[PDB]
Each structure stands twice: as C-alpha cells, then as structure tokens.
C-alpha cells in the first residue's frame, strides 16, 4: 500500500490526468443528471413546489 | 485542360501476365483470355487466367443448378412462352413453402418444394465459394482477410434464409427468389415488425453503408489526388513511406485533426464494410424472435415520443 | 421470447445494442492505435518531442519482411527526415508557416517536397525492375490512345520545352508511368503521366513552365529509376503548381 | 486621396464577391422555382411528410 | 520525465501558477456574487 | 505537436482568400479564411439545435428535432419557434458545408495535390441541397424538407417513401441502391486484399501487387488493378449519390403516383401486352 | 490581475484576436436570436402589436 | 497543496488555457440553457408574467 | 484608445478590408431577410 | 515596434485616419437610414 | 515564459491597448443594457 | 520495471502532490454530501 | 497460489491494469443501474416513498 | 493427466488466457441474465415479494 507511488513508474502521468479529469467530470455530470431525472431530487422543481412558482 | 487521372489516356500492352506460382497447383490455372480495350480505359485489360480446382467445380456446378432451377421455374411460370418470359421476367418468383408446413420438407414442388431444392444448391454454392476464397489466399501465402470479410456477408445471407426461418419455425419466413419478389419481401418484412427504421441495428447497419460510401469516396479521391507522387501503389508506400503517403496523411490531419497511415486506412475500410452485414444480421435475427414491433420497442427506449 | 426483460426494459435487444457500444469502443481504440505506426511521436516546431502526445498510446512494434532481401521494417521506430529542410519560421509562436530560405523547388520544401526513400529500383515478384523504358521492355506497344511519341511538349507558359522520346511503363501493372522528354539541351527528363495532358497534337504540362524542364532531377541510369529519383521527380513537378505559376 | 479610393476598392471587392455569390444562389433558387411552376405540381400537391411541429 | 515535460523551470512554473490562481480567484469571486444575487432574487433552496 | 515529417510541408501559400490574415494552424487543424467561416457556422448551428431543444421541452438527444416550417407558410419565412429556427440552421449547415469544401481546396493547394477530395464532397452537398432546398422549392413549400432530429428524420424518409407506395420501385432508386451495395462490397474486397498482401500468412515476406492481381484472377478471373480499384471506389460512391439525388428530384415533381405502376409500360408494350399467360397476362 | 499582461507572452495576438472576433459575434447573434424566439422579448412583434398593425 | 504549481511542468499552459476556455464557456451555456428549460427559472418568462406582457 | 491604430501593424490591411467588405454585406443581407420576413416591415409587398 | 505585417508607425496612423473617417461617414449614412425608417414605422 | 517572443514592455503596451478596447466595448454594452432595462426590465 | 522514465524520487514527489490534491477533492465532496444529506437524506 | 506473481511475466502490466480498470467501472455502473431499474432497490425512490416527498 | 502440462507447448499462454478470460465472463454474465429473466429465479423480485417491498 505504501508503494502505491510506483504506479507513476508504470503509467505516463500525462495520459492519467487527462483520462482521470474526463472520467471525473463525466461521472459528476452523470450523477447530477440522474438526480435531475427523479422528480424527488430535481432541486429546481423542488423549489418550485416549495415556493409556489408554477 | 487538366488531367484528373480518371481514364487512362494512353494504353500500353505487352506479354500476358500469367501470375506467380507460390504454392498454386499450376495445372488447375487456365490460359490467359482476351484483352479488352474498353476495360483498359479504366483498369487492366487482361481477362484471366482463372483457377478452377475442386471447390471451383463444386461451387460452379451448384451455383449453376441454383441458377438453372430458378430459370426453369420461370419458364414454367411463363407457360413456356419466350415472349411471356421476357415480358414478366421481373415478376416471376420462386417462393418458400406456405406457413402451414412450418419447417417440414413435405411441401409439393409447386408449393415451396423447388424452393428447398434451389436453396440447397445455393447453400452449397455460396459456402463452397467461401472455402475457395480461403484456399486461393493460402496458396499465395497471403492473409485470410478476404475469407473472413466474406464470412460477414455470409452471416447476413444465412440469417435471412436459414437461421431465422429455423428460429421462427417456418420456411415461409425466408426470401423468395425473384427480382420484384424479394423487394416486396423486404417491404413487407418492415411492416410486419413495425417500422424497421427503429431497429437499432438496422440504424447501425445503415451507418456503415453510408460510412462505406463515405470512406471509399474519401480514400479513392485521396489516392487519385496523390497518384501523381506514385500513390496508387499503396503496397510499396507501406514498405518505404514516400511523399504521397505524407501528403495524403497531412491532408486529413489538417482537415479533420487526425489521419491514418497507408496500411491503417485499409483496416478502416475492411472493418467499416464488414459491420454493414455483421450488424444487419443481428438486427434481422432480433426481428420477430425478440422484438415484434420496433416502433413500440423504440418508444420504450427513448427514440420516439410516447 | 418477446418482451422478456432481465430488468427494467433491458431485454435481449438491449443486451445486443449495449454489447455493440463496448465492442465499437474497443474497435475504435484498435483502429486508431494501428494508425500511429508512422509519424509518431509528435515533435515541436523545431524538432524536439512535444509535451502532448494524445490520449492514444503508441502501439507495439511489428516487423515487415521485405520481399526480395530488402530488409526488415519495424514500425513504429526511430524516424528522421534524412535531408536538409531549408525553412525558417515566420513567427516565434507555434502554428505559423515556415518561409523557405531560398529557391523552394530546388531546396525541396512545401508542395515541392520529396522523401529520402530507398535508393533502389522497385521490383516485381520476379525480382526485375517494375518500371523500365518501353524500348527495353519486350513486346510492349501502345494498344490504344494517341501514341504520345514525337509530339512537342508545351509548358504552362505556352512555349515548347521539348519532345517525347520514350514511355516508361510499369511492367506487371501494364500502365504508362513516365514520359521521357528530350530537351533542347539534348538531355532527357522524366515527367509522370498523371501530370501530363496528351492532346491530339501535343503534350501539355500545366505544372511547369518552359524554362523549368532543365531543372527536373535527372536519373543515374538511362534504363532504371529508383524510389529516391521517383520522389524527387514527382515532388519537383507537382511543386510547380504553387511555386512556378506566377 | 488615392488611399481613400484604395480602401474603398478593397472593401467593394469584398462586398462584390459576397453579392455575386449571394445573387448567384437566388438565380439557382429562382430556376427551380420557375421549373416548379411549369410542371404539373400544384395540381398534385403531396401530403406533408413531417408533422408541422 | 517528471522533472518537466513542457520545458518550464521550477521558478517559471511558480510564476505562471501565481498569475493563474489570481485569475481563478477573481473569476470565482464574480460567480460567488452572481450566485449571491440570484439566491436573494429567487433561491433554489 | 507536429508529425515527424510535417515541418517541411507547413509553408505559406495556396489561400483563396487572405494569405496571411488567416494562414495558420490551431493545433493540427488548418484555420483558413473558410476555417473561420466553418467554425462560426458549425458553432452557431449546434447551439441553435441546443436552443431548439429547450423550446421543444426535451433533453434526450434522440428526441430533439427541429422541424421545417409547416406547409401553410409556403416558401417564405416562418416564426422561430415554428420553423424559423430550421431555416437558420439550414443556412448555417449550408454555410458550414460549403466553407468546409472550400477550406479543403486551400489544403490541396498548400500540399500541391489534386482536387478530387473537395469535388467528391460537393456531391454529398448537392444531394443534401436537393432534399432541403431544390426539391422543396420545386414542390412549393419548405415543409417537404426533412427535420433535424436523430429519429424524426427517419420518419420523414418513411412518410415520404410511402406517399408513392413501395419506394423500391423507383427505377433510379434501384440503380442508386445497386451502386451503394457494390461500393460496400468493393470496399471490403479492397481493404482485405491490401491487408492480406501487407500482412501475409506468418513469417512470410510481404507480398507484392503482382500477388494482388494473381489472387483476384485466380478467384474471379479478372483484376481491375491498383489504379482501377481506386478510380472505381470513387466513381461508385459518386454514382450512388448522383442517382440518389436523381430519384428524389423526380419524385413529387414529375412522378406523382405509385412507383409500382411505372413498370407497366414494359408489361404493356404493344407486341406482348395481350399474350395470355404468365404473371400479368 | 496586476500581471495579467503576461497572457500575451503566451498567446500570439494574431490568433487570439481572430478567435475572440468569432466568439463575440457568435455570442451576439446567439442572444439576439434567443430574444426573437421568445414572444416576450421579440421587439419586432411587440412593435407590430403595439401599433395595431395586425 | 503548496506544490500544485508543478502541474505546469507536466501540461503545457497553451493547451491547458485553450481547453479551459472551451470547457468553461460550454459549461456556462449548458447551465444557462438548463435554467431556460425549466419554467420555474426562465427569467424571460418570469418577467413576462410579472409585468403582464403576455 | 488613441493607440487603436496599431491594429494595422498586426493584421494585413490589404486583406482585412477585403474580408470586412464580405462581413458587412452578409450582415446587411441577414438583417434585410429578417425584416422582409416580418409582416410589418415586409416592404416588397 | 511589432511589425507583424510590415508597416511603419507613421504609416498605420495615416491608414487608420483614412479608415476611421470612412467608418464615421458610413455610420452617418446608416443613422440617416435608421432615422428615416423610425419616422415611417418605429420599432419601439 | 515568452512563448511568443514579445518582451515585457511589449506585452504591457499590447495589453494597455487591449484593455482600452475592452472597457470601450463594455461601456457601450452597459449603456445598451441600461436602455433596454428602462424599456422592458427582465427582473 | 519503469516504462515511463520517472526515477524513484520523482514518483515519490508526483504521488505526494497528487494525493494532496486527491484528499482536497474528496474533502469537498464529503462536505457536499454531508450538506445534501441534512437537507434531503437518501436513507 | 505461492507462485501467482508470475502472471506479470506473461502479460504487460500496463495493458492488464487498463483492462481491469475499465472492466471494474462498467461492472459497477451496470450493477448500480440494475438496482435503479428495480423499484425494490431504487434508493432514490425508496427515500421518496418513505419520507413522503411526493 | 500426467502429461497434460504439455498443452502449453502448443498454445501461447497469452492467447489462451485472454480467450479463457473473455469466455468465462461472457458465460457468467449470460447465466446471470438468464436467471434474472426467469421470474422464478430473479433474486430481486423474490425478495420484494418476500418482504412486501412493492
Ligand atoms: C467470428 C469468427 C472469427 C472470424 C475472424 C477470424 C480471424 O481472426 O481472422 C482475422 C483476419 C485474417 O487474419 P489472418 O489472415 O489469419 O492473419 C494474418 C496475420 O496474422 C496478420 O493478421 P492481422 O494483424 O491483419 O489481423 C489482426 C486482426 C484480426 O482480428 C480479428 O479477426 C478480430 C475478429 C473479431 C470478430 C468479431 C465478431 C463480431 C462480434 C460482435 C460483438 C457483438 C456486437 O485484429 C483485429 O482485427 C482486431 C479487431 C478489433 C478487436 C478489438 C475489439 C475489442 C472489443 C472490446 C474489447 C474491450 C472491451 O483479419 C481480419 O481483420 C478480418 C476482419 C473481418 C472479420 C469479420 C468477422 C465476421 C464474423 C462472422 C460474422 C459475425 C458472426 C456473428 C456475430 C454476432 C453473433 C450474435
Ligand atoms: C421498407 C423497407 C425497410 C428496410 C427493410 C430492410 C430489410 C428486411 C433488411 C434491410 C437491410 C438493410 N437496409 Mg434497410 N430498410 C429500409 C430502409 C433503408 C434505407 C433508407 C434510406 O431508407 C437504407 C439506406 C437501408 C439500407 C439497409 C442496409 C444497411 C441493410 C442491407 C445491408 C446489405 O448490404 O445487405 C445485402 C447483402 C447481403 C444480403 C449479403 C449477400 C452475400 C451473399 C452470400 C452473396 C450471394 C451471391 C449470390 C449467389 C449471387 C451470385 C451472382 C454471381 C456470383 C455473379 N434500408 C426500410 C425502412 N432493410 C438488411 C439488413 O440486414 O438490415 C438489418 C435486411 O435484411
Ligand atoms: C458523396 C459520397 C459520400 C460522401 C463523401 C464525402 N463526405 C465527406 C467528404 C467526402 C468526399 C469530405 O471530404 C468531408 C470530410 O472531411 O470527411 C471527413 C465529408 C464529410 N461527410 C460527413 C458526413 C456525412 N457524409 C455522408 C455521405 C457521403 N459523404 C456520401 C455517401 C453522410 C450521410 C449519408 O449521412 C454524413 C453524415 C462529415 C464527416 C464530413 C463533413 C464535415 C463538415 O461538414 O464539417 C463542417 C460542419 C460541421 C462541423 C457540422 C455542422 C452542423 C450544422 C451547423 C448543424 C446540424 C445540421 C445537420 C443537417 C443536422 C442533422 C440532423 C439529423 C439529420 C441527424
Ligand atoms: C465467447 C467467445 C469469445 C471468447 C473467444 C474469443 C476471444 C479471444 C480469442 C483469442 C484472442 C486472444 C488475443 C490475445 C492477444 C495477445 C495478448 C495481448 O496482446 O495483450 C496481453 C494483455 O492482455 C490484457 O491484459 C487484457 C486481458 C487481461 C486478462 C483478462 C481476460 C479478458 C477478460 C476481460 C473481460 C472480457 C469481456 C499481453 O500484453 P502484451 O502483449
Ligand atoms: C449481469 O450480471 C450481473 C452483474 C447481474 C452478475 C455478473 C457478475 C459477474 C460476471 C461478476 C464478475 C466479477 C469479477 C470477475 C470481479 C473481479 C474483480 C477484480 C479482479 C477486482 C480486482 C481489483 C484490483 C484492484 C482494485 C487493484 C488495485 C491496485 C492498485 C490500486 C495498486 C496499483 C499497482 C501498483 C502501483 C503496482 C506498482 C508496482 C511496481 C513495482 C511498479
Ligand atoms: C448537468 O449537470 C450540471 C451541469 C447541472 C451539474 C454539473 C456540474 C459540473 C460537473 C461542474 C464542474 C465544474 C468545474 C470542474 C469547474 C471548474 C472550474 C475552473 C477550474 C475554473 C477556473 C477558472 C480559472 C481561470 C478563468 C483563470 C484565468 C487566469 C488568467 C486569465 C490569468 C492569465 C494567466 C497567465 C497570464 C499565465 C502567466 C504567464 C506567465 C508568462 C507568467
Ligand atoms: C444560453 O446562454 C446564454 C447565451 C443565454 C447566456 C450565456 C452567456 C455566456 C456564456 C456569456 C459569456 C460571456 C463572455 C465570456 C464574455 C466575454 C467578453 C469579452 C472578454 C469581451 C472582450 C472584448 C474585448 C475587446 C472588444 C477588445 C478590443 C481590443 C482592441 C480593439 C485593441 C486593439 C489591439 C491592438 C491595436 C494591438 C496593439 C498592439 C501593440 C503593439 C500595442
Ligand atoms: C440576427 O441578429 C441580428 C442581426 C438581428 C442582431 C445581431 C446584430 C449584430 C451582432 C450586429 C453586429 C454588428 C457589428 C459588429 C457591426 C460592425 C460594423 C463595423 C465595424 C463597420 C465598419 C465599417 C467601416 C467602414 C465601412 C470604413 C470604410 C472606410 C473607407 C471605405 C475609407 C475611405 C472612404 C472614405 C474616406 C469615405 C469617402 C470616400 C468615398 C469614395 C465617397
Ligand atoms: C432463360 O434463362 C435460363 C433458364 C437459361 C436461366 C435463367 C435463370 C434466371 C432467370 C434466374 C433468376 C434468378 C433470380 C431472380 C434470383 C434471385 C435471387 C435472390 C433475389 C435471392 C435473394 C435472397 C436469397 C437468399 C437470402 C437465400 C438464402 C438461402 C440460404 C441462406 C440457404 C437456404 C437453405 C435452406 C433454406 C435449407 C436447404 C436444406 C435442405 C436439406 C433442402
Ligand atoms: C456506453 C457503453 C457502456 C454502457 C454502460 C455499461 C453498462 C451496460 C448495461 C447498462 C444497462 C442499464 O441501462 C439502463 O437499463 C434500464 C432498464 O430499464 C433502462 O430503463 C430505465 O429507463 C428507461 C428510460 O427512461 C425506462 O423506460 C425504464 O422504465 C427504466 O427502467 C435505463 O434507461 C438504462 O440506462
Ligand atoms: C451558386 C453559384 C454562385 C455563383 C458563383 C459565382 C458566379 C460569378 O459571379 C461573379 O464572379 C466574378 C468572378 O468571375 C466576381 O468578380 C467580379 O467582382 C469582383 C469584386 O467586385 C471584382 O474582382 C471584379 O469586378 C469581378 O471579377 C463577381 O463578384 C461575381 O458576381
Ligand atoms: C437555404 C435554405 C433555407 C432558406 C430559408 C429562407 C427563409 C427566409 C425567407 C426570406 C424571404 C421571406 O419571404 C417572405 O416571407 C413572408 C413570411 O411571412 C411572407 O409573408 C406572407 O405571409 C404573411 C403571414 O402573416 C402575410 O403577411 C402574407 O401572406 C405574406 O406577407 C412573404 O410573402 C415573403 O415575401
Ligand atoms: C459569401 C462569401 C464568399 C467569400 C467572399 C470572399 C471571396 C472573395 C475574396 N476575393 C479576395 C477573392 O475577392
Ligand atoms: C454606403 C453604400 C454602399 C453601397 C455598396 C454596397 C456594396 C455593393 C456590392 C455590389 C454587388 C452587386 N452584385 C451584383 C455583384 O452583387
Ligand atoms: Fe487503397
């Protein structure tokens, strides 16, 4: 576990960060979209329900 | 005017090229046929020689029987009238047996029996030709890409006529042997399964039929563009890269942002064409067996409003 | 088994469509990395390796054996434009053109570029020369079309630059490759057929003007042309459409 | 006053091509418009292929 | 080479990073005020 | 970020418009005068499709559609929510395609190669302009053009085809379909034949174009050659699109009825129209 | 921001000014079109209704 | 945390800045379009209803 | 403000003016088509 | 200074002076045209 | 540092003119927005 | 083996910065999850 | 088991890790989406139906 | 089975294990889906029916 630093001797640091940054953003976009799909977690229309904006 | 290298302005002809005998049984290979000046305006002028061995005999004689069986049925359907045969040539059809028989072989020769006979001749002729396609490459010590690419087209052929009719339980599901007949089958196949346009694999299969047309127009235009630098001989460009391959790559690098090599473009070409019939086989095999309405299935999968 | 879904609406048709997305992604990775066997790794504007190499890693080397004892080509491998590129950058920043430091056609830059290939003739399957003059090839004649031998050669300036002496033919392909044109200087140059327009009474070369035929690179053997000479001749002529049509 | 005429001719050369290309397309549209009205259309009006939206 | 793929030296990267974060803090400060104005106008919570 | 052999090819020249105003590369892409035009038209059309989605009320990409103006508007303008956005996106798409074709011409001049590629792309453009501009102009309204949706432009194809019965019976359709099938068959053969030569059996010398001719003469008795196959591939696709646009410029402008009835001119030729027997007699 | 001028020691003005010109005109047409599509802020029809032109 | 500046010894600032500008603008458009999509937060329709301009 | 003239030391004047003629004409065509579409400002009627 | 396109410092000022004078004169015609339409049919 | 070749004194002169055009551009847009918010406020 | 070219101490330093940013990103997400859970729990 | 470490002399470590990383991600996304499609384990709607959100 | 170990002289270990790795996973996934398709062995629908989760 301490020797996890040696993944950087195996994988090129440049490709890892581009791959990781894309992975994190696409994942975060995906999870924000799943909540928007559910009416029970769509925070935009929860506020409409709460504040009577319809 | 400017020469666009679409027709050969000058033809040069010499001794007939008899080919190379790597491992070829030189007995089976015939003699060189005639030279066509008309074909020489576009490509090579030499016709032949052709290798007709053991799988050539089996494929050509079975293919002859398939072709001749359908022809005699058309003469019977014309009442043995040469004028009526000419008139209704595109309307004659040899049809599979009625759905009442299912997959049974007990159908009369006029009610789907000759279809089974003709179908067997086609089964032997097409599959033997794949073996011949494989063996012709082997004798020259070449790769088997032609054999395996052909196997993709055989896949759709076997799905249409053999595999799916077995899975549907009746030969009546198969394709009739006719010109306007198999067009009606195609039109009616979509209507029975609810707008085949919404089959995801029919949609993908079309993406690669347009992609093949897009890719061969691109590749064919690219090579004729760099043909002035000896670009048509792609095989020697792979061994020793020249200015034709560099200009061809740098055109698509500056245009699209990515390019290919002289050898790698033919991996795009072969893979784009095999997916036309590889994907089409699955979409056809899924129709009726798994989905009996592609518009309703589409509605449950996005693709269409509720 | 219509309507049978393992979960939600995921039936056998969903398994097929989702399995293809995975297969297509693997195929696109394979097809792209098989196209990184030439021209990589990426360089800077001066020659040094760039700090960005792209999402796709380089593939593993493959060896091509050459059909007449011509050696083994392994790609991807060490690469170098083995020639004196005569260019000076027009800007310190990247992405801007490079201006020639002199005559562009002679120096071999821009649309007049050539690649330092193997300086040997191209061979057919029998080991002979793929391209050779028609008077040396036996049994070759002009089967159709205007025989472009003895016609004057007119340049893009509508001035005669010579007349055709022979046709260099591709023996196994059986197609004309070059026109050998004798100049008023008495020497002979090769012009690729794709760059000529054979009319009824002349051969018109739109690329070069009249006073440039004497500058076409020559060949070290009267009956043998090599890949290096082909690339210099083809590159020089086609480079005149830009640097020699003013 | 050569520079004033120089800049104007540079711009008028730019605007001339934009006009030349633009009014070249209108003739092409006008061509199919004329050929449309000399054919038996408007007596065989096809149905709407797509919902009006 | 983790000792620099881009040719920047250590001190040049520090200088470049200081200017970059200054723009990042300015750009985020505008977004904080923009969200503060929208939340007072029409809260989403 | 250049290919190892790219330095000697980046030279100034071969620009139809400008010369140094827009003569540079952004990464690997060449930014011409028409690269600026292509980006603007490509970007505006995309965001309009994104904007048309919020007017439609959906975010599923497979449900987003931009519909042409209704048949009541004829050949004039339309409101943006109804069909005005389609007309802007069609203009934006038309500008982006022609700029892309014109930008390829500048690349051909800078590399000194032939203009086969931009010429072949114009065939695609002319087929597209036939469906959205030329054919609707003849028929009289913008509402005959297809909508800009992933699955709704298929509904336009299906609905237009069945207006004339089975569209398989359009004679120019049959010719075009034949060219499309031949082009894909030849592409499979061309890729496989070159790959088999470059990648022989195992531990074997790379084959030669003399093996390529020999393979197809052994197989089918003829070989079009290395130059012939590339001319054929270009011409099959251009022919496929030419007869594609031909079959739709004659549908609804010259031919108005079922396409099945067309083939009765052959079956009712005077010298065999009355012979009894067969399918039609 | 006392040293934002260093951006021009990174990006060539010729490519920046061209890119910024396309962005500003793309953004302008984008917004002017957004208001036209919405009936609330279509100034061409607000005038038409205001002066009873229909 | 105090040695993040070494990201510039791995990625080129010219490609990082170009990607970031494209990403931030596209993210800005995506969020602005999402709000206009929702009736509850469409600022054009809110003022239309508030000031009675329908 | 008084140094905007240095825009002509960066871009080519003989090429900017040609392109600026194209831009001003296409913008003019764009607005006239929009005006021509609206029933109130359709002047060709 | 920069000399990207090869114009002297006093060459750019003279070209800009001519270009700007045409720009204002072009805008004067445009404002006249806009004022004519606004009198005929105001859009506000 | 110095990817484009301009020195410090050139960058500041280049950035001095750029910001002047920027503040000019925003000033016109500020007035345009103020006028439109007078005519038809969106808040 | 070492396929990239980084020496052992470079791998130590590259990991040290990466993990320092890895905790920062996960620290902010923990606070965001703890804030959303109070407002509207999913369990 | 004592000699399982030889696996890395047969296969490239760089290709194994990318192969496994993609496999693990897609498998976890598949299982998570399988539970979301089952109303018995959809944790988003379970909370909604428990806290009377709707 | 004493001489089974010579199977490896005939086949590459690399080509066999990839073929075995793909085959085992595809067989396993297929059987799991076949069980989910049958209502009698869907372990998620059984639990819902057992615990009254619908
Ligand atoms: C299938 C039976 C195998 C046939 C091919 C055998 C073969 O290896 O020949 C190689 C063939 C010739 O090899 P060779 O001459 O022996 O080699 C000479 C030298 O060694 C030099 O040879 P080479 O180096 O030129 O050949 C290398 C080539 C050879 O490799 C292949 O042949 C790959 C074949 C893949 C077949 C896929 C079948 C369809 C699967 C669809 C999945 C569902 C959708 O490598 C590839 O093409 C790799 C292709 C892409 C692989 C990466 C895809 C990853 C997927 C996802 C992974 C990550 C997640 O080369 C080819 O490229 C052929 C391409 C065309 C293949 C067509 C296959 C059609 C199959 C029948 C129709 C479909 C059946 C039903 C499918 C759906 C069922 C429901
Ligand atoms: C109204 C009808 C339906 C429709 C119904 C169908 C049906 C049914 C099918 C298709 C299929 C296809 N459709 Mg569809 N299709 C429709 C609309 C379209 C549109 C369009 C613009 O609207 C297009 C472009 C397409 C295009 C396509 C292709 C992508 C695909 C055919 C691939 C192919 O090449 O098979 C042709 C190639 C073969 C069949 C292989 C043949 C190879 C054999 C082995 C060789 C035998 C040779 C023989 C013996 C002759 C020998 C002669 C001598 C040697 C000389 N369809 C509409 C919606 N379509 C096919 C498919 O698979 O898609 C899922 C299919 O089955
Ligand atoms: C004419 C023979 C075939 C052909 C040839 C061909 N295509 C070509 C070329 C050639 C020679 C190119 O050089 C050019 C290229 O660079 O390819 C990589 C291209 C090209 N052909 C392409 C696509 C394409 N070709 C097709 C067909 C064909 N292309 C023919 C069959 C199809 C089909 C059948 O559907 C498609 C989708 C591109 C990959 C490329 C041209 C890229 C381009 O135009 O770039 C500039 C424009 C954009 C970046 C996008 C603009 C987007 C719009 C502003 C908005 C959207 C409008 C659109 C109409 C919406 C559609 C909605 C629904 C219908 C889905
Ligand atoms: C049901 C029908 C399909 C099954 C049969 C068809 C499939 C394969 C047929 C045979 C093809 C074998 C090709 C192997 C090529 C040599 C191996 C290779 O080239 O890659 C190897 C690494 O593979 C790696 O880590 C990646 C693999 C690591 C081990 C995991 C095994 C793969 C399973 C992953 C999930 C698959 C879905 C070796 O790296 P270097 O060289
Ligand atoms: C549809 O089907 C369902 C889903 C219903 C059921 C199907 C289930 C199936 C088919 C399940 C299959 C499950 C499988 C096969 C799971 C396998 C899981 C495995 C093998 C997980 C392994 C994980 C390994 C990990 C996470 C290792 C990580 C290692 C590191 C993070 C350290 C990196 C290594 C370094 C740094 C080595 C460096 C050393 C040197 C000397 C350089
Ligand atoms: C669909 O789901 C939704 C969208 C609803 C929710 C999802 C949201 C997501 C996934 C959001 C993701 C957001 C992220 C990751 C945002 C990241 C924002 C960042 C990183 C912003 C940073 C901005 C920094 C800027 C603009 C800095 C600019 C700096 C300058 C202009 C300074 C100039 C620099 C110079 C001059 C370098 C110095 C040069 C020398 C020579 C020293
Ligand atoms: C769907 O969402 C909607 C569209 C509704 C809302 C979304 C809105 C969004 C995403 C808005 C984004 C807005 C942004 C990022 C706006 C940024 C605007 C900027 C940065 C404008 C800058 C303008 C700067 C200008 C016009 C500067 C001009 C400079 C000059 C004319 C100086 C000339 C330079 C010279 C003379 C060179 C000097 C050379 C020497 C040697 C001194
Ligand atoms: C679709 O969205 C709409 C259209 C509704 C809303 C969008 C509107 C937008 C985005 C509009 C954008 C407008 C812009 C950016 C306009 C910019 C216009 C500019 C900068 C015009 C500048 C013109 C300058 C000119 C014409 C200078 C000409 C100078 C000369 C020709 C020099 C010599 C001429 C002299 C001295 C005049 C006297 C000479 C003679 C020969 C009479
Ligand atoms: C004057 O003319 C003469 C008489 C000299 C010769 C003329 C011949 C003529 C006019 C021939 C016309 C031929 C035509 C129109 C052929 C058309 C063929 C078409 C359109 C075929 C299309 C599809 C066919 C398919 C997909 C066939 C698939 C068959 C299989 C996949 C295998 C079938 C095998 C089966 C069903 C089982 C057989 C097994 C047993 C044990 C019987
Ligand atoms: C991109 C390649 C990799 C893909 C992801 C890797 C996993 C591949 C298998 C994914 C299977 C799960 O995929 C998921 O299946 C469920 C099953 O109904 C679908 O179905 C769900 O949404 C649809 C559409 O709103 C509803 O009609 C349905 O009632 C609901 O159950 C999801 O829309 C789909 O996202
Ligand atoms: C669809 C097809 C669109 C039409 C394509 C162009 C048709 C020809 O259109 C015409 O072309 C010529 C070049 O020959 C252009 O060129 C003309 O104007 C330009 C600009 O003022 C000047 O260089 C000169 O007066 C003249 O060459 C014209 O501006 C254009 O009106
Ligand atoms: C490039 C392919 C796509 C091109 C798209 C082109 C669309 C732009 C069209 C510009 C020309 C518009 O042309 C104009 O349209 C308007 C639309 O109300 C028509 O206006 C007509 O309908 C309106 C409807 O209220 C009525 O006032 C009246 O019947 C008539 O004026 C005009 O008769 C026509 O002259
Ligand atoms: C529509 C605009 C098409 C391009 C117009 C500018 C091309 C003409 C420029 N130039 C210099 C040749 O005149
Ligand atoms: C200030 C008034 C300006 C008037 C000139 C505007 C540009 C004129 C372009 C003329 C083009 C004519 N044509 C037919 C080529 O399109
Ligand atoms: Fe090729």
Author numbering:
A (entry chain I), G (entry chain D), H (entry chain F), M (entry chain K), N (entry chain O): 1 to 54
B (entry chain M): 1 to 306
C (entry chain H): 1 to 246
D (entry chain X): 17 to 69
E (entry chain G): 4 to 48
F (entry chain L): 1 to 281
I (entry chain A): 1 to 45
J (entry chain B): 5 to 48
Describing publication, verbatim:
The light-harvesting-reaction center (LH1-RC) core complex of this purple phototroph is characterized by the co-existence of monomeric and dimeric forms, the presence of the protein PufX, and approximately two carotenoids per LH1 αβ-polypeptides. Here we report a cryo-EM structure of the monomeric LH1-RC from Rba. sphaeroides strain IL106 at 2.9 Å resolution. The LH1 complex is composed of 14 pairs of helical αβ-polypeptides, 28 BChls a and 26 spheroidenes surrounding the RC with a large opening in the slightly elliptical C-shaped ring structure. Cofactors in the RC include four BChls a, two bacteriopheophytins (BPhe) a, and one 15-cis-spheroidene and ubiquinone (UQ)-10 molecules at both the QA and QB site.
